């Protein structure tokens with residue numbers, strides 16, 4: 001099934017090559033910004049990244065092999081998680097700042113403008129600091145990001161010939177674990193160090209789920225009281 | 241810290257011994273279920289389990305080494321996750337059902353009266369079936385429960401470094417268990433990844449559950465113990 | 477849904 | 486303080 005035959009080095013290669021581009025914000029000398037304004041940049045940004053995420057997902061080995069319904073469910077569950085780990089990744093070398101775009105580099109005080117954002121901000125920063133302290137490697141990040149796509153929604157599927165899908169997603173997931181271990185052995189880590197590092201990486205995914213949960217809550221809070229049609233749809237999936 | 245001095249076997253033995261008992265529900269089979277009465281049984285049950293949890297937590301190696309303020313944070317963050325993994329664990333041998341208590345064993349239909357309960361129920365059943373398909377062992381479960389306790393709040397903070405080395409010690413223990421079970425080395429790292437990725441879904445379930453709980457608490461559906469109120473408040 | 481469309485094309 | 490704090494403090 002193509003993805004299962006891939007080698008560890010080919011998986012990395014496939015993932016690195018699948019990477020989306022880094023979009024810029026439409027922030028300008030308009031300085032400064034209000035609650036509305038800052039919110040606009042974030043959502044416009046996320047909206048535009050969503051298009052690229054979808055085409056990136058199609059290139060995640062094993063994703064195409066799934067039904068259109070299952071692909072949809074995966075992205076619906078994962079999109080904000082995927083955006084967030086992206087953000088924290090490119091914010092790694094910017095302690096105390098969140099790099100939404102090369103031209104949009106926010107510190108936590110700017111996050112105060114916009115309610116409840118602070119707390120989400122702090123969590124993203126702490127995650128970024130954690131990645132920094134672990135010296136997260138780029139090849140590890142693409143594995144983690146793919147893992148999120150495949151994992152975050154797999155348990156909200158289901159009977160019938162759907163178990164065939166779940167099993168396929170888990171075979172691919174194992175492949176990616178093999179790939180992470182491979183990257184670690186290559187890096188020279190001992191066996192004990194590999195397992196430990198694997199564990200450390202995956203536990204951070206729980207925190208990333210938590211941030212998406214909260215963020216999704218706030219995003220919904222704010223749309224009740226201008227988000228793109230796509231965003232709104234991606235958001236409705238988390239509210240039955 | 242003697243936590244770090246523990247061997248894999250000492251780690252497992254400590255955790256197995258610290259296990260809380262299976263408690264019973266105030267279930268009364270003379271009255272029909274209402275949203276309020278079901279929520280009553282559930283929250284009464286959770287409340288009593290919490291006391292046992294607080295005492296179990298103090299027995300998780302390393303936990304005692306933290307400040308009271310940090311112990312409070314971790315429990316505040318993980319309490320529902322921890323109740324949920326326990327529930328999912330004891331429901332393994334009951335396909336299609338959730339054993340909240342030996343006298344409170346429900347299927348998805350019995351929760352329809354309750355706001356959001358069927359949604360969470362379905363998620364819990366899925367996790368239970370997954371643990372069942374993977375053949376989760378008791379020794380692995382207690383490792384998982386302790387990881388949740390130590391991990392779920394550590395990012396919302398030295399002490400943080402102390403927690404990580406305890407967690408590493410639990411990773412060594414999980415692998416040790418898997419070797420002892422005769423899994424290949426590749427199977428070990430694959431199983432480790434599978435188990436930990438399920439924690440992301442337990443996190444998910446906790447957060448969705450928390451939100452339904454807060455909704456109901458704000459609609460006065462059921463009187464909540466002051467303990468539960470404060471744990472519930474902790475999540476804003 | 478829009479997502480359907482983007483996934484198809 | 487918090488009931489949780491007392492319960493732990495005990």
Ligand SMILES: Cc1cc(O)ccc1-c1ccc(-c2ccc(O)cc2C)s1
Nearest residue numbers: 042043045046083084087117215218219
């Ligand atoms: C989640 C959220 C909650 C709020 O209360 C306010 C704003 C947001 C956000 C909207 C878009 C965000 C965003 C944007 C771009 C990106 O590359 C990654 C992220 C994560 S965050």
Ligand SMILES: Cc1cc(O)ccc1-c1ccc(-c2ccc(O)cc2C)s1
Nearest residue numbers: 282286323324327355356357360449452
């Ligand atoms: C969280 C929740 C949401 C709803 O919509 C309806 C009910 C609940 C629950 C209340 C108590 C629950 C519970 C209780 C005891 C236990 O050992 C494990 C759990 C999980 S679940």
